[PDB]
Amino acid sequence: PSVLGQGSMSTRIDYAGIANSSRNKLSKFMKITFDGEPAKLDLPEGQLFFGFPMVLPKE
Amino acid sequence: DNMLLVDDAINDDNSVIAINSNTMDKLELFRGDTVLVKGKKRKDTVLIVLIDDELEDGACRINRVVRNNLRIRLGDLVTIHPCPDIKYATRISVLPIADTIEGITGNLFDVFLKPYFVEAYRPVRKGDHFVVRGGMRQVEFKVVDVEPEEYAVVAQDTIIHWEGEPINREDEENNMNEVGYDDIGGCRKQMAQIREMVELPLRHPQLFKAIGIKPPRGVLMYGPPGTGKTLMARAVANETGAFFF
Amino acid sequence: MQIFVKTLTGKTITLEVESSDTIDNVKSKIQDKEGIPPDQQRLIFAGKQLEDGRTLSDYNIQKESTLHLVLRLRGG
Amino acid sequence: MQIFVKTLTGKTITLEVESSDTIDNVKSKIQDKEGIPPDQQRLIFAGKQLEDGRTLSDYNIQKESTLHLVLRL
Amino acid sequence: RYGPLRIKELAVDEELEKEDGLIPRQKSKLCKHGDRGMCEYCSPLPPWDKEYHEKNKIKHISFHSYLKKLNENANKKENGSSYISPLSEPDFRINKRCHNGHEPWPRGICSKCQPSAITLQQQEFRMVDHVEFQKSEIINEFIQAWRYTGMQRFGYMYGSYSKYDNTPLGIKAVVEAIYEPPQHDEQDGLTMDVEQVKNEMLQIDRQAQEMGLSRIGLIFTDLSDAGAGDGSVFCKRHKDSFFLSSLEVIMAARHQTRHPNVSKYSEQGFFSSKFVTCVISGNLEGEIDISSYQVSTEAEALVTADMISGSTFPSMAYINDTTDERYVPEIFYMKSNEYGITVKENAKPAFPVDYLLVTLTHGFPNTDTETNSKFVSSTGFPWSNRQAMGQSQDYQELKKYLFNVASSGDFNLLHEKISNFHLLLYINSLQILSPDEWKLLIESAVKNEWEESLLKLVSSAGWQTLVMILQESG
Ligand SMILES: Nc1ncnc2c1ncn2[C@@H]1O[C@H](COP(=O)(O)OP(=O)(O)O)[C@@H](O)[C@H]1O
Ligand SMILES: [Zn+2]
Ligand SMILES: [Zn+2]
């Protein structure tokens, strides 16, 4: 389904946008994955985010 | 003036002190008045004043228990001050002495203390000793905790918590801290040095404020081991009554 | 006589009327101060369906008395 | 006129509607404003689910009052 | 204070402090001595013995036993000190008033009021050990909310603490009922205004305290159904991935700091709130098993001075920067490498949060032992804030629920239909009843030996008026 990274509260806050900006994080004048570094994802008190792309076990 | 002479009271009550009429007039005291009596080692207690003309002027009568609590002997001097702001003890938590309760059957509190404090209004302070003579036995106790602190009057409605384990007697004796200058001899010079270097900065700070100097802080005692350095330091600290650490 | 009346929501008001006076008078007072037709006003106390055709005497209600108000339509 | 309505999301909305129009008009106002059809919405006040056949006067809804909204297809 | 501080805390802490927890041991085959006298192997085992725990599969040391360890380690009796308080909570806020000669922090700082480096290390004492649910219905209905709607949920849980024999000097939090605040739940998350939620929870907490309960944690569901025909959910939370993302840890730390545990052995008198947080995600299989966690004391004191924020990587928490009114020193998280050597790695960019957690063990009471449930309920009157679903508390619901039994009798049936949490809260909100009338209502509903109290309730005028209005209402 869409709840694997692209749903509600993942489009209100550009989580994919945050990840991509962290990737190309330079002045300089889509896919979401865990190949890189974290970028500060700050939300106000009283908001919980469960929309992180799942990872599943070792299988 | 208020340096009442110590004497052995005829009565055994733990909250009664008999004074001469002349002294009563001098200090404006009266019979039944609760006053704060201070003896030696800064020990303090609250006693009910009773007029008694047999005593010579300037002399007061206190019992053995009060003298032991104040750590003073017969013929000493005790300072008496008004104690008008003493409230009634909301709750007094007290436990007996183990040795004094050996062989006692039934509820100790009802047998001994229940008639002692009811309709008595005896002022009690923490750390004091009171003895009750019930039937054929005499039992000493300790004022472990008093609410309000540090002392208060045990009224009829005051709740007395006697629940708890017995208190061993050996603790008071074999742990004989609060040792005064009377336990140290032959080192008067060094004792005087330590006194003048410790007490005055603490007991009378205003002296150095008036003169306008910063009193010295550190002090280093040294000498052969076993000469009582620790004893001297403990004695000075206890005499000063400061927060020894 | 001083009395308390609480509506369905919880709003509380204080009214005055004679005990022997018919409760119809108090119902009319409440109506005129809130425009509530007499039928639309139902007064309850101790589970009793109070009605205009009586007074506070028969209900053993005196000063400092609290009653509840409800609309007979379908509930609150 | 001035009314308050507790929404489903858990917030309160202040709506302006005269007390001389059917509650169906209020339902139309809310549903148009937020887009949730009134065919399923139900109103609640004093534990009295307001039947659509009656207006505000019948309940004598006082000004700056408050109601609740619930959903049931 | 010349001795132990004077302050009153829960009864559980008092009774625990009374005991000693010494674990007796018998003559080992390695002893060489007579019957009396004990050498090194026959001595009683202290309650905090690390070997005993790890040998019994217990991961943390039951905080009270930690207090016993700290008291034994120091504080010699009758001499040697004047009772330096053993416990003290961490505090990382820079002292704005130090003044060796320097000015306040914004324009001056000496080496005495400079927050030294912070060394994160996994905690060893868990304040609350076993979270226990009186009846499975409590969480079954909570999950049923998501089942019907599909969106996530979140709710505080009320209950009380008690002893727990299975762990040396251990504690269990027994949860009696769950209360749901007004939240704007969604598919991937939820949102709830903090101010309004706390305003409502203040009065809900007052009423619960009147009932004898207390707020002892928050439980939320992280559930997403799989494509399987029957009920199966993906296991997103396990050793491979994160257990609790950074945001959840932050929220748990805030809540813990806002419910301090009053204790007698600290300078401030409080330490390491007892506030368990539980999460539902599903084990490796399709089950919906729950879990429990509790953020360590440092994270509790690390987030009061900001210094942490969520990160796009679920298992790592981002670190903020220095600025006026907020000084953040270097953070080292100390692990142990496979060769049994402690290693300090500087983590300014981001560090895992598994060093900011301690795990608990959920469970349910034995289904054939004594039942001391306060509430025989959780299947009936709709719960509070389920407006989104068809659930809606109102007069007609009460008429349909508790009118036939009320109008006839069946005092057993009336009692079993009157000891429901949400029903009591709703009728209290009705305000139809007087203060002492509601007090006797709760004493009849949430207590044993309830005959005369229920009889008094029914005999009262308030109940008569309530049933009358219920009858009047459709
Ligand atoms: N007036 C005194 N002068 C010296 N020693 C004394 C005196 N009175 C008692 N003592 C004894 O001398 C010893 C003093 O011990 P001390 O040297 O102070 O110990 P520490 O090694 O800790 O300094 C104790 O046994 C004490 O009882
Ligand atoms: Zn041995
Ligand atoms: Zn400084």
Author numbering:
A (entry chain H): 230 to 258, 281 to 310
B (entry chain C): 33 to 277
C (entry chain K): 201 to 276
D (entry chain J): 101 to 173
E (entry chain G): 107 to 580
Q: What does the literature reporting this entry say, word for word?
A:
It is composed of the Ufd1/Npl4 dimer adaptor, which determines substrate specificity, and the Cdc48 hexamer, a AAA+ protein that couples adenosine triphosphate (ATP) hydrolysis to protein unfolding. S. cerevisiae Ufd1/Npl4/Cdc48 was prepared and incubated in the presence of 1S1UH-mEOS and ATP·Mg and analyzed by single-particle cryo-electron microscopy. More than 700k particles from three datasets were combined and segregated by 3D classification into three major classes of the Ufd1/Npl4/Cdc48 complex: no ubiquitin nor substrate-bound (“substrate-unbound”), bound to substrate prior to unfolding (“substrate-interacting”), or bound to substrate and unfolding a ubiquitin (“ubiquitin-unfolded”).
In substrate-interacting and ubiquitin-unfolded classes, all but one D1 domain is bound to ATP, while all D2 domains were bound to adenosine diphosphate (ADP). With the β1–β2 loop coordinated at this site, ubiquitin occupies at least two states, UBS1-A (akin to “Ubprox” in the structure of Ufd1/Npl4 in association with K48-linked di-ubiquitin, here shown within the context of the full complex with Cdc48) or UBS1-B [akin to “Ub1” in a structure of the full complex in association with a polyubiquitin-modified substrate (28)]. Distances between distal ubiquitin bound to UBS2 and Lys48 of ubiquitin bound to UBS1-A and UBS1-B are consistent with a covalent bond between these K48-linked ubiquitin molecules, although densities for the linkage were only observed between ubiquitin molecules bound at UBS1-A and UBS2. UBS2 helix interactions with ubiquitin were observed previously and include interactions between the hydrophobic patch around Ile44 of ubiquitin and UBS2 residues Met574 and Ile575, and polar interactions between ubiquitin residues Arg42 and Arg72 with Glu578 (28, 37). Other major differences observed between resolved substrate-interacting and ubiquitin-unfolded classes are the orientation of the tower relative to Cdc48 and the positioning of Npl4 residues 437 to 451, which forms a loop atop the Cdc48 central pore where substrate enters the hexamer during unfolding. In unbound and substrate-bound states, this loop is positioned over the central pore where it could clash with substrate as its being unfolded. In ubiquitin-unfolded states, the Npl4 tower appears perpendicular to the hexamer plane, but in unbound and substrate-bound states, the Ufd1/Npl4 tower tilts back and away from the Cdc48 central pore.
